[PDB]
Symmetry: D3
Subunit: 283 residues, 6 copies
Amino acid sequence: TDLTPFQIDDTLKAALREDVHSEDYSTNAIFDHHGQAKVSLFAKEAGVLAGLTVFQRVFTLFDEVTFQNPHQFKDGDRLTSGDLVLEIIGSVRSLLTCERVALNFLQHLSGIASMTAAYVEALGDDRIKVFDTRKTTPNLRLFEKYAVRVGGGYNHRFNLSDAIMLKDNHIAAVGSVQKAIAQARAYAPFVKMVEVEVESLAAAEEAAAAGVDIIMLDNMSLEQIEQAITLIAGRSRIECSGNIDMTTISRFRGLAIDYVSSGSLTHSAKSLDFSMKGLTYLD
Amino acid sequence: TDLTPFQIDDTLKAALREDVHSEDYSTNAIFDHHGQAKVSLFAKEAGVLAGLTVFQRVFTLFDEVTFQNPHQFKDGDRLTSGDLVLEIIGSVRSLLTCERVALNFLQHLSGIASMTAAYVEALGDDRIKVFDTRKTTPNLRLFEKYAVRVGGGYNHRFNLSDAIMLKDNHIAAVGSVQKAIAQARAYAPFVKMVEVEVESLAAAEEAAAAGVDIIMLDNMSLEQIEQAITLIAGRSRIECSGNIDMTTISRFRGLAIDYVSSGSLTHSAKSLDFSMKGLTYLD
Amino acid sequence: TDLTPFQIDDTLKAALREDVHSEDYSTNAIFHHGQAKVSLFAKEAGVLAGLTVFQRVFTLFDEVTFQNPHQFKDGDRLTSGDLVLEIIGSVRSLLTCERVALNFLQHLSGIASMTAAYVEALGDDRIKVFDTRKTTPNLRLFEKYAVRVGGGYNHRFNLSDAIMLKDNHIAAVGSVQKAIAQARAYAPFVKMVEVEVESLAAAEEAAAAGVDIIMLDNMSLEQIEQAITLIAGRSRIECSGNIDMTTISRFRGLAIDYVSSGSLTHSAKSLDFSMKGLTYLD
Amino acid sequence: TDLTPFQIDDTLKAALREDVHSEDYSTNAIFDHHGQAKVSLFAKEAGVLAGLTVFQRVFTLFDEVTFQNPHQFKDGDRLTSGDLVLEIIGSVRSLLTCERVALNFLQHLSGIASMTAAYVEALGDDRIKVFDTRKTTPNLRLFEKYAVRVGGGYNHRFNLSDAIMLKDNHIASVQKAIAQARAYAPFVKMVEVEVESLAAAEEAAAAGVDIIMLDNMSLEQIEQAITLIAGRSRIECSGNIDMTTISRFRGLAIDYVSSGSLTHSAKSLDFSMKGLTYLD
Amino acid sequence: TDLTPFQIDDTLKAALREDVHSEDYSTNAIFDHHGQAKVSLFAKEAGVLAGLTVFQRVFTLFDEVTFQNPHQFKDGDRLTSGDLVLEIIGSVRSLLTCERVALNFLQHLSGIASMTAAYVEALGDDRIKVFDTRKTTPNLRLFEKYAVRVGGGYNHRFNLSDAIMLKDNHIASVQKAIAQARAYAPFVKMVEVEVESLAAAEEAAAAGVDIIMLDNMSLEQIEQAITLIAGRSRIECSGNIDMTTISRFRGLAIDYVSSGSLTHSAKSLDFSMKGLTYLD
Amino acid sequence: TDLTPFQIDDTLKAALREDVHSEDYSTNAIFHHGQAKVSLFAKEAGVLAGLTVFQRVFTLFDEVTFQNPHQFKDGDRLTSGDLVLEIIGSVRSLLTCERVALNFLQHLSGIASMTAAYVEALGDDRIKVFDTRKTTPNLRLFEKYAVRVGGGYNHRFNLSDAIMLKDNHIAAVGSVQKAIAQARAYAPFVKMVEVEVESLAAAEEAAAAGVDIIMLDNMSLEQIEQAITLIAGRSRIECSGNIDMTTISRFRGLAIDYVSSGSLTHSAKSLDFSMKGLTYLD
């Protein structure tokens, strides 16, 4: 589901203002006469397209700009270098001044979508979902979460307010898996999912017995993981997390866990290369 | 030179608000009684430290929090996994709730500094500087620029307003390298540096003759580059750019150019791993 | 857990600015930067909520200290004539910062009091009283807090917190089970899913679909009872709609998990307080 | 006079942001390739309509949304349960995601207007006017003041900066207080004094103040004060005023009364949005 | 009465942001391991001091900065060139990066105060008062209004919402205009009317308005109007008022005059920050 | 190049809000949503600047159209009694949105006019007239524009735009050459570097150090002339300080690149306009 102007406008404005504090001298010195012009957006690298309407919105907040999409490209579609993703039509000053900010969004989000897509394939198991985390670029979580969905991934909680996750230390402070779970439930009844991070087979048992929604198996071995699965017997949903990357992710293939999660999808994504070229004046 | 609260506060607040829309239920359910506590910040990966005071400021905007720095770590210092970078002292709720946002800044910036440092070494020529670009994460340019300086790199223009750069299309619109340069100068006299992107040996000549400040040699071969240098004869500063990464950067070693620039330093930096662990209550 | 400056400061500042566009002429004309004391009195029985909010209004504006002779705190029961707080500072800060502070305190204490009253009227510990998103615009955080203070509980703060498939959602999709399926496909595992249901058939459909919470909307006791057995613990159960002081007792003793009321936040009478007894200080 | 985007937009945006921090998951999950949809706004309780354009603006900031108003309803009109106030047309996403915030405004403002209208009717004297106060919901004063006008009430000062009012501590020679106000103020502020005793009412009237407030002073007292003031100032009666009480002032020669409870503790008026159908 | 952080902070922050978009490169380039430094604020031109605490606040929002005031200067005090108004102590980075913004405020406000003071002296009659207008620099009205008070002037309405003023189009039966204002307004707004002819001045005074504005009406006219008005209203003379002109009103029984040029076209007053030295 | 809505809208809105806190009572009491026309007249000779700003104030507030009989634009010379614009819309929008619009227009036209006057007084094309950072807080953008409109040129907008090593910077470091060296080391290649210099010795030091721009601060003509030859085109030259209408002509014919004046922006008299001649429309 696409991102809306309500959601993105303030962020894009800020970004435009970051890149232009007075004016775009280089563009304004050369270009004048205010003729309409056309520029093309080209993919320069293979991957997955994400953030296209975000890209567009940067231009549209700045000036009156229209678009042409010859190949009907949309977020999710596979890209190959040289592909004509969009044509952008408007005044020269608007096209050149808005370009870098627009691309910066598009490159970043397409990079994440691409990487998410790659992880899914590397895993090669539909039955196991690929989830993101809170290890996101500050103030862009919304956009990054979106890119992950686009790439075929799924969203974990957005927030510390969304859902409860009882980590390593939380159990210790209470001194029982069961008590930590109980206090969580008492504190925020009914309307919050509760998850627990567990390093131990005993703790996984304790937690499943307590009736939690999701159990996180933290950096556990395959032997350990397999035992836990049988032990839990579908009493909770099972997430594997930690030390999960392109090389590692395939180890989970075929297990009866519900999902895995990776921070790298959002904290360490390479951006995907695009360029805007072929500027011509309209007749 | 370190980042100031005036510069970073609004951004960090926004980030905190992004991660906490109502409250941190998971932390609030388990922890109460408001005892002071101590937590340790550990490096988990080798590289360069950047964003330490940013990390700190996240806690300090939220609550009364103090720090201890046993090893006197500061931005720029080399890190090795297991290193104790900081101890953070304050109320448990403040420590756990602020953790992820604080780390997200620290990881991201240290990742950039590390990568910048790596590029500098790979180049192995002091006489040639490593510069960043405008291919930055929207609304964090300031922070990323800083991380590049920390890693031993240098800053290009911050902005479209900072300085003039006449790219591929700008020359064509005017139809002469010399005329584009002239119009730039006429438009913003004296107080703006002027740079031109050049793909051709002829154009490099034209530009040097015109008296520009900086000539950018775009994706040119070493043979081409070397000819241009001799041809320009120190009439302008020389930047090489395009297709510059870890593998490629060493090709510039020993040339009489002033600097090279890379977008990857900011658009495709891996974050550097840290963790906050060892939570204990103070006596 | 109390509200904090990080959470409340921008709101209180805005409120102060609303009440003082240039200066407080009437107070300034008569006054000194000469210390004074004023007393905060409860003028009506109920539950105290928003005391640190009240305090913060003064503290943002000027250097002001407080005395709390009776160690009053949010959640405590109030009776008229009670001395809740003494406020000490310059006369100008006290007079100018009075109306705004009280406006917060009166409003929140009103909500807490009303929440507390609903809980008692229900007279069943086993059934919790929840709030809603029918809140006063731009004060949700504060109102949600007041409900907790009065012994109530918080429903989702937001459209982003949890999924709730209401009448209008069901209509857009045209089916209960299909709407749940889509919600489940869209936000697996980490979001609770709730459905509003008007009929027993739909309650069945929903329970079978494996939702987390079923809302029984404005259903009769007979209906409710049937639904309970029929749902058979496959989901949590909430009752909602047409729930007020008179009505709430009807849920007493049922095997539902909670009830929810918009009135707690959209129609709460404010609780009366006054600030009086200005002594001068030396 | 209706409220404007210039006045309300920032507030509504903040309200929308309060209700949607990331996304509207429930609505986004049901997203489909359908076209535009229509939903109806129904009154569910009798009273007075206030905040209709505010209601509308919540949708219009968010997305492209149009309206149909079959019965030509406008702020000030009387409502009866089951009344079709508006039809809202636009994308399903916009209608459902904007609903609660829009209704929260409408319900709150219609509640105040209704209550104001009820107080007016209860007092029954057109000779008097019913005024509001500064006992308003923080950061919504502008909207609440509007609702009071809509319900047939009148606005007192918006602010501590609008006009001068002399209080208890301030009251502590009350002719000297008036003098200082007028002097300390430029000659562009109305001055009002709150008075408990008849002696003070006279001093004040002699002082040439603009408005004299008779505080919780009973009918005999009030009646004497009126005569004594002899039209030298405007007269406000205040304190201990409620639906039950307001009738005591019926027919007195005073100019107005004021009530905090109008904004202070107004019930919201019930509405609902239902009947979602896709357009053809 | 001095300005407050609650009033000024957002404005100053915006000003600082205007002057520093990324960083203060010039100052950061010279960063060293020195300690605290001291810099002096000097008056460089004679006039009246206004905006001193505003000046101070610019530094204090940014960083930890302290002040020393050897001569106990405060807003309203007369200045002579070479006067040491303040010493500013803090880190070099904070002093230099905050300087220009802080001075811009101080210079602007001291300029207005000075000009106001000059107008007062020029008119020479304490019986009259000198008032400002709404002809203010956008988004700084609050600060400019303050400076006018500091220079011995007085404040007219801050706003279109503060008070009522009847204009030319509005003037087009002028007793009916007054009636509608008072009716359309609640009984809490001062009403003023701008009048060109003596007939209108009388109608208005009879109407019981609070302030009558005699517009660009000359001394003979003015003098007749005064007598005719007979203290039924306050009298303002306005239009065609300047340093040269203001003296014509000396000794008339009018209450005040107003000038746009006070805020409209005030020269800023020169100051400088110099004498940077490191502390020991 | 004209100012734009993206650039100006938030400022104008703030300005409107400053002037109208609730409503325009005086205008509303008398009025219609009945169209009317008003004329904008120049009341004083000078240069027109800020016309589209003027227009935008109305356009943000309501639906308003304009007629420009004489095709006036920013930069054009004005003479009193000139009809600059006709404004058409509802009476309420015209009366309420009048003072703010004019305040912008008067201010900017004042700056443009003053800039234009300085250029003429200088009477040397070869020497440009620059502005400074001595601007009215929060209007720099607008003032910088007005200077260009009057035939002037813009200096750095910001502390972030370019490096300028002033008196106070030189003191902190204790040397001219060392300050330049540090600036050069800190921001190589992409930032211009300028130094303020009071003495010939320092001018030499600076030129030798290879700066981009030397500022000759409040120096005598004799000094200036010596400096020019001595600098020998190693840097651009700016003269600044104590530069006004009377003084500016002294620079005529020197081989300097430009002069700068704070007065253009900190001490500009506003240019008089009025809005009158309200016809009603049908």
